[PDB]
Amino acid sequence: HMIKICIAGKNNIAVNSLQFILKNYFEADQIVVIPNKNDKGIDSWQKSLLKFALDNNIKIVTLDEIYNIEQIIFFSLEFDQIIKIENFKSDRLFNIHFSALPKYKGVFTSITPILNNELESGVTLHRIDNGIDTGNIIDQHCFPIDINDTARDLYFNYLKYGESIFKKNIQTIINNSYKDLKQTNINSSYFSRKDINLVHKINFKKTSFEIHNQIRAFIFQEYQLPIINNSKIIKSILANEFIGYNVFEEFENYFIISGIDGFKIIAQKLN
């Protein structure tokens, strides 16, 4: 068919990966795009896929419009819809998921690995099957969650590494010469929206590492910041200085906190 590829989703990973295909592989007339339902068609703190496509004379389609395109490559890059694979003639359906699968299937993956005490995360390119982030893994890139990284910092890492893993593998996908491996049952985890209360209530009867992690997992200013006694927190810093157990002291610009193991946290208040 004339149309070779659909890019579906949002943000700079989608925009940049589309730019890369336009520059290196396919002409506009060979590409269609499905923006997310919330795409305003203007750039914000991320670029708009809708705007990029219109600016570049790529057609905006719906899923209904591509299901019958033989051999189309369908590529989800932060797409907001669950696919049903039997809708499609093509079986060339792919996603980049922002975690180190099989762990942290589902949502809010800039939050969940932090909240669960992980030292690393990853991006994973996989085939789409009918389950949520369950299909066979094509490629994965693991990277650290540094000790004072926030959810926002981690999200910007997913965008960066996600764009790179796209570029690394896209020719094998286009050539249908990639290899994949089924995901294991062990280590598989999943979160849905119901599992995370974005207005997090910190549990201080925890270690310093855990309290620190509770704070920084919710630091993502475009959405929210965690609040301690009515002040928003912009950064948490965990040190291995021992300051005594269960410290909590509020100052004008920051809190000094330690948990049951007495390591020092500085929780910096938003200016």
Ligand X SMILES: Cc1cn([C@H]2C[C@H](O)[C@@H](COP(=O)(O)OP(=O)(O)O[C@H]3O[C@H](CO)[C@@H](O)[C@H](O)[C@H]3O)O2)c(=O)[nH]c1=O
Ligand Y SMILES: Nc1nc2c(c(=O)[nH]1)N[C@H](CN(C=O)c1ccc(C(=O)N[C@@H](CCC(=O)O)C(=O)O)cc1)CN2
What's the min distance (Å) between Cβ of 195 and its own copies? 7
With 0-12 CB in 10 A as exposed, 13-18 as middle and 19+ as buried, what is 57?
exposed
82-111 mask for ligand Y (x: CB under 6 A)?
xx-----------x----------xx----
Q: Name which of its own copies, ligand Y, ligand X, none residue 81 binds, using a CB cut-off of 5 to 8 Å depending on partner kind.
A: ligand Y
What is the per-residue burial (b if ≥16 Cβ within 10 Å, else e) of 230-246? Answer: ebebbbbebeeeebeee
Radius of gyration for the chain, computed over Cα atoms and rounded to the nearest angstrom: 21
Instruction: Report residue 83 CA to chain centroid gap.
Output: 18
- Residue choice 157, 259, 267, 269 for contact with its own copies (CB under 8 A): 259
Q: Which stretch binds ligand X (CB under 6 A): 74-82, 123-131, 164-172, 202-210?
A: 74-82
- Residue choice 48, 76, 124, 214 for contact with ligand Y (CB under 6 A): 76
CA dist., res. 259 & res. 208, Å (int) = 4
Query: 255, 266, 203, 196: which is closest to 231 by C-alpha?
Result: 255
Residue pair 151/220 in contact (Cβ under 8 Å)? The answer is yes
Binding of residue 256 to ligand Y (CB under 6 A): no
Compare residues 12 and 76 and give the one whose CB is closer to ligand Y. 76
Q: Which stretch binds ligand Y (CB under 6 A): 10-18, 73-81, 172-180, 262-270?
A: 73-81
Report the side by side order of strands in the sheet with 231-242: 227-228, 231-242, 263-269, 254-257, 248-250
162-201 mask for ligand X (x: CB under 6 A)?
------------------------------------x---
What's the min distance (Å) between Cβ of 205 and its own copies? 5
Compare residues 159 and 173 and give the one whose CB is closer to ligand X. 159
**Distant-in-sequence, close-in-space partners of 60: CB < 8 Å, separation ≥ 6:** 32, 33, 34, 35, 50, 53, 54
- Contact positions with its own copies (CB under 8 A) in 111-150: 116-117, 119, 130-132, 134, 147
